[PDB]
Amino acid sequence: GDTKEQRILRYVQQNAKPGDPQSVLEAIDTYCTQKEWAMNVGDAKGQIMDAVIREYSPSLVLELGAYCGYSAVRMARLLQPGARLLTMEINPDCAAITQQMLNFAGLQDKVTILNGASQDLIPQLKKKYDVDTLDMVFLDHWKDRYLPDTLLLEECGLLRKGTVLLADNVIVPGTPDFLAYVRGSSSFECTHYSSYLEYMKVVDGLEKAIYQGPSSPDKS
Ligand SMILES: COc1ccc(C2(c3cc(-c4sc(C)nc4C)[nH]n3)CC2)cc1
Ligand code: NA
Ligand code: NA
Numbered sequence: 001g002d003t004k005e006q007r008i009l010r011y012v013q014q015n016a017k018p019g020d021p022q023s024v025l026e027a028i029d030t031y032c033t034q035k036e037w038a039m040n041v042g043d044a045k046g047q048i049m050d051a052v053i054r055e056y057s058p059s060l061v062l063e064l065g066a067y068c069g070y071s072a073v074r075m076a077r078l079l080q081p082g083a084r085l086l087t088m089e090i091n092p093d094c095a096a097i098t099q100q101m102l103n104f105a106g107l108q109d110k111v112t113i114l115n116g117a118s119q120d121l122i123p124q125l126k127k128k129y130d131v132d133t134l135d136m137v138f139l140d141h142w143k144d145r146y147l148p149d150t151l152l153l154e155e156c157g158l159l160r161k162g163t164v165l166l167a168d169n170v171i172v173p174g175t176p177d178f179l180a181y182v183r184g185s186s187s188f189e190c191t192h193y194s195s196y197l198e199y200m201k202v203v204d205g206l207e208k209a210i211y212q213g214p215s216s217p218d219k220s
Contacts, residue, residue, distance in 0.1 A: 004038060005068050005097045011035070012104060019106035021077035028070050033198060041071050041140065041168060042198040048206055049138070049166065053078040056164050058135030062125075063087040064118050064149065065141030067094055069101030075138065076107040085111045086129060088121050090141070118149045123156050133160040139167040146170075146178035154187070154214070163211040170207040172197060182209040 008031055016027040025046065032040045041049065053075055059082065066072050066089040076085045089095040095115040102108045112129065114121050118141060125131040137153065139146050146167055153159050165188075170179055182188040188209040197204045 003093070004036060005094055007036065008032070008038060008068050009097050009100055012101065016104070018104055021073050021105040021107060024073050024101070024105045025070065025077075028068070037199055039067055040198075041074065044195050044198065045168060045204075045206060046071075046074050048193045048195065049074055050078060052136070052164060052166055052208065056136060056162075058164070059083045060131065060134055061085045061136045061138065062134050062153075062158075063138045063140070064145075065089065065139070066098045066113065067140075069098035069105075071138060071140060072098060072102055072111055072113075073105045073107060076102065076110045077105070079110050083110065086114065086125070086131075087111060088114045088116065088118055088141070090115070090117050118145060119152060122149060122152050122158070125158060126156070131158065134158050134163055136164045136166065139165065140169065143169060143173060143175045144177075146175045147181055150178065150182070150209075154211075159211040161211060161213045165207075165209040165211070167207045167209070168204075170205055172200070172202055172204040175207075179207060182207065185215070187212050187215050 011031045012024050012027040016023040029043045032038045066087040072087045095113055099113050102111050183190045190209045193206045
């Protein structure tokens with residue numbers, strides 16, 4: 001039984017070149033803009049992601065919401081040797097697509113795919129995936145989970161001063177609880193990157209929130 005996600009993967013395999021992540025990105029963006037809409041960061045937002053990756057040169061990245069693997073390919077292709085992407089995907093079939101997408105792109109050695117819910121997997125990272133702290137987190141999963149998973153990352157000790165969080169769709173459909181919290185909290189230094197939705201003629205944006213450390217207890 002044919003699914004949209006299988007169709008995306010098929011289009012890449014036919015038209016992109018194996019071992020060429022850039023051709024894979026172009027294939028998906030072409031498919032989604034010309035053939036069939038799909039939840040896709042798209043190339044405009046993708047360039048903001050690229051710039052963030054290049055600026056901070058993360059050695060360990062956590063992605064929430066891999067879907068078909070476009071963002072995983074986008075980020076992993078800019079990771080240095082020894083750098084790692086951990087990506088989480090709650091749907092088993094999408095997780096399988098993401099693995100095949102990364103395999104095709106030649107990036108499978110840089111990426112660990114975890115199939116499960118963010119709130120179940122995030123607390124296992126220190127013990128099971130030998131994580132200390134994360135250099136960067138990309139949020140693009142269920143929008144009502146941005147705030148609680150950010151709070152969970154903090155309390156699990158996975159954030160350090162300087163950790164970049166980059167969150168997509170903070171305007172459309174919107175994550176106002178997440179935005180209120182990080183912008184108002186002194187634990188996060190925030191900036192907003194506006195970008196037009198490729199399909200919709202509505203303005204969206206990514207929020208970049210840089211962790212400053214835990215807030216200090218009240219003194220004497
Ligand atoms: C209806 O809107 C959607 C639907 C699906 C998605 C995707 C997604 C979400 C997750 C979740 S959810 C959760 C609690 N932990 C994880 C890891 N993995 N992949 C991207 C496929 C994003 C937005
Ligand atoms: Na998105
Ligand atoms: Na803030």
